[PDB]
């Protein structure tokens, strides 16, 4: 009842412990030292270090004034236009910072903010740009209005590679003196799919359940990403194997039919080595199956029929 989960127990506290985005992290460290941090928008996918890097930047920049300098607002807090009109008193506040240092307003999850709040944030960013700076962190940069993106320097975080995931996993393991093998860590990375948080959670679960991180123990409690099983099912040559996947690896494993249909839609959108006519025909068949599922017929026969139609439009 005293231990913290490894996700939060090993959250980086300095910019040097943030794997991945080598160039972006180096730039962030340079901003931390030089100062004069511009307005920034940090996008990317979950589990890459968009908030563990903005918090580390604010720490290493403000330092001792990290209590009167970092006004953190997120989706869990109310962020209406009225709040943006807490963000004005904080900007008007005068604090004696070291030369080159500015106050930071970390608006985590800025993609969920209302548009009135953003239209007022523009006013605050325009009138008080010389004293405070804004650090937007989001998952999709398009959700921030263009006038706000105009005043900010956009930094896009890419997916974390297998090497930057392996390096951090090795650090955490050496700190936690757990036992592993190469295949087990490879499986953990494979199931992570570019997610550091999911990799840490899977490693923690494997250590707790069994203790030794090998392929069998990892795969008996962590499942291989089902988008990849959907892709394997949709690229089968003959219908036997496709239906076989649909049954064994998707139906008897407990996945819902609607989940399979949605995953198939995304897989088809991102599928390669398939003609455009074939792709759009498969999209149409998947849409019809989605319609049938949403109307109530959530049966395995509908999915089997969808796979049969996909094979029929593939072979011709």
């Amino acid at each position: 009842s005293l231990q913290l989960p490894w996700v939060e127990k090993y959250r980086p506290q300095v910019l040097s412990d943030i794997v991945g985005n080598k160039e972006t992290i180096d730039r962030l460290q340079q901003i931390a030292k030089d100062g004069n941090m511009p307005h920034m928008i940090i996008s990317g996918m979950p589990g890459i270090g968009k908030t563990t890097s903005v918090h580390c930047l604010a720490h290493e920049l403000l330092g001792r004034s990290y209590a009167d300098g970092v006004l953190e607002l997120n989706a869990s807090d109310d962020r209406g236009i009225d709040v943006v009109r807490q963000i004005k008193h904080f900007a008007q506040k005068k604090l004696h910072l070291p030369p080159g240092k500015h106050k930071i307003v970390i608006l985590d999850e800025a993609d969920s903010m209302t548009a009135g709040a953003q239209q007022a944030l523009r006013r605050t960013m325009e009138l008080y740009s010389n004293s405070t700076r804004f650090a937007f962190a989001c998952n999709q940069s398009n959700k921030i209005i263009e006038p706000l993106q105009s005043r900010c320097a956009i930094l896009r975080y890419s997916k974390l590679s297998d090497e930057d995931v392996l390096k951090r996993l090795l650090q955490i393991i050496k700190l936690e003196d757990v036992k592993y093998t190469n295949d087990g860590l490879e499986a953990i990375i494979f199931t992570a799919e570019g997610d550091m948080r999911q990799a840490i959670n899977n490693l923690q679960s494997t250590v707790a359940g069994h203790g030794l991180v090998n392929a069998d123990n990892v795969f008996k409690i962590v499942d291989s990403p089902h988008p990849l099983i959907v892709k394997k099912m949709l690229l089968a040559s003959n219908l036997e194997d496709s239906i076989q996947i649909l049954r064994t690896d998707l139906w008897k494993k407990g996945y819902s039919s609607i989940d399979i249909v949605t995953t198939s839609f995304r897989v088809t959108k991102n599928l390669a080595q398939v003609k455009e006519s074939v792709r759009l025909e498969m999209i149409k068949e998947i849409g019809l199956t989605h319609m049938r599922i949403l109307e109530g017929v959530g049966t395995y026969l509908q999915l089997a029929s969808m796979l049969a139609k996909i094979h029929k439009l593939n072979n011709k």
């Binding site: 160039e23 972006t24 180096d26 730039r27 340079q30 030089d34 511009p38 236009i81 993609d111 969920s112 209302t114 548009a115 009135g116 239209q119 007022a120 006013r123 740009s129 010389n130 940069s141 398009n142 959700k143 921030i144 209005i145 263009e146 006038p147 993106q149 105009s150 005043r151 900010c152 320097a153 956009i154 930094l155 896009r156 839609f265 959108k269 991102n270 455009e276 006519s277 792709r279 759009l280 999209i283 149409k284 998947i286 849409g287 019809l288 989605h290 319609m291 949403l294």
Partner: protein, 423 residues
């Protein structure tokens, strides 16, 4: 401070604006500073960072001390009190009032108050008024948190939706739309900034490789402020940090043209479609887009393509219309349209011009027809104890009843085809 704040223009010649647009704005502004000037408002609309207000500030720093400051608003009736005191800025107080700050227009009540107060400004009987200028930035408003309102100002933040037709059409209101900064001006100015930072860029050893980024930036964004911010970020950097600039939204007709003809940037249909859905799903998820596709797929080759292709396109559109509002429906329809037009496309085609669907006109005419039929029904109910269903009014009486009620008059009642004639 920041390059977009330290290298700000000090004169109009440093302003990144086209010559013709500059001339139009200058002549309009000077005409608005005349004792009795036909135009009372100057509504500047355009994308973000198009020197919409930069040019206005420079121009009011010359025009104001010639016939007499910019007095910018600070955003329920607070704007009323502001404008209640924004009319005394008469001669000896002539200070071009700029309303770049828009009182919250996402709220129905104060949006209507904004519109109905600017109308009172337009119809004011005061003999002397200050030059009123409103800057509106056209920016598509992202997809909200399940907002089921899905109103007009919940899709696009544009002048048309903030103001009402009367406001935008008032004879005393002049509208000058603004265009994204052309690459010529962008390179010309991003190089002036570099000959002012050639010192650091030299010691950084990037002064040599400066025109490469000056051109890539000039080709990636029309936003001058975003261009300068990206230049500052690249110059102060050390390594090969990727050059990323802000992302702009395509237009409705731009999206239609991309679906029909394609894009030169990408010769891949799948990638282009996926990117259009990712960045623009606030328009590709509206039925008006499919109606536009149906209305404008005949503008390819001026309508000189096979009938089988047209039949396939319309059949697919009809099929996807019965797929509900599912995401797969649009992804199928647009993909099929693009495939069909890709196979038939060649060189030598003088493509036509696209147009907005006329469905709104049909709906307005339907409403007019309903209004016509209702009068007939109640007249009959009070003068002939006659109840007739609207279906029979639209199929039989709409044509026979007025013909008889007019011919009998030929020798209170309707004498013309209910809802106008069929053409």
């Amino acid at each position: 401070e920041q390059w977009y704040e330290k290298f700000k223009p000090n004169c109009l010649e440093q302003v990144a604006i086209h010559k013709r647009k500059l001339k139009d704005v200058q002549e309009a502004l000077d005409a608005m500073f005349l004792p009795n000037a036909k135009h009372r408002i100057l509504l500047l609309s355009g994308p973000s960072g198009c020197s919409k207000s930069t040019v206005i500030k420079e121009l009011s720093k010359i025009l104001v001390p010639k016939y007499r400051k910019v007095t910018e608003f600070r955003g329920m009736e607070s704007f009323s009190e502001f404008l209640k005191g924004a009319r005394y800025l008469v001669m000896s107080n002539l200070s071009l009032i700029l309303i770049e700050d828009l009182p919250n227009v996402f709220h129905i009540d104060t949006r209507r108050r904004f519109q109905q107060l600017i109308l009172q400004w337009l119809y004011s009987s005061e003999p002397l008024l200050p030059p009123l200028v409103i800057c509106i930035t056209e920016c598509e408003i992202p997809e909200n948190d399940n907002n089921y309102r899905k109103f007009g100002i919940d899709y696009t933040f544009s002048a048309e939706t903030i103001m009402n037709k009367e406001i935008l059409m008032h004879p005393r209101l002049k509208r000058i739309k603004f265009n994204p900064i052309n690459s010529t001006l962008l390179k010309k100015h991003l190089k002036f900034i570099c000959v002012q930072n050639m010192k650091m860029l030299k010691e950084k050893n990037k002064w040599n490789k400066r025109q490469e980024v000056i051109d890539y930036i000039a080709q990636e964004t029309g936003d001058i402020r975003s261009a300068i911010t990206t230049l500052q970020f690249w110059a102060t950097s050390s390594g090969s940090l990727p050059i990323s600039t802000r992302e702009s939204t395509i237009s409705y007709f731009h999206a239609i043209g991309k679906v029909i003809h394609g894009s030169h940037s990408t010769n891949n249909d799948n990638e282009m479609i996926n990117n259009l859905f990712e960045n623009s799903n606030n328009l590709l998820s509206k039925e008006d887009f499919k109606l536009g596709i149906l209305e404008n797929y005949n503008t390819f080759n001026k309508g000189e393509f096979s009938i089988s292709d047209a039949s396939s396109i319309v059949d697919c559109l009809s099929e996807c219309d019965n797929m509900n509002g599912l995401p797969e429906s649009n992804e199928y329809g647009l993909r099929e349209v693009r495939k069909t037009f890709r196979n038939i496309s060649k060189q030598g085609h003088n493509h036509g011009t696209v147009y907005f669907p006329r469905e709104w006109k049909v709906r307005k005419l339907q409403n007019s027809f309903k209004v016509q039929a209702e009068d007939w029904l109640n007249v009959s109910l009070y003068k002939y104890n006659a109840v007739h269903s609207f279906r029979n009014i639209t199929l039989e009486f709409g044509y026979y009843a007025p013909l008889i009620r007019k011919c009998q008059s030929y020798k209170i009642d309707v004498v013309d085809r209910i809802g106008g004639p069929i053409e």
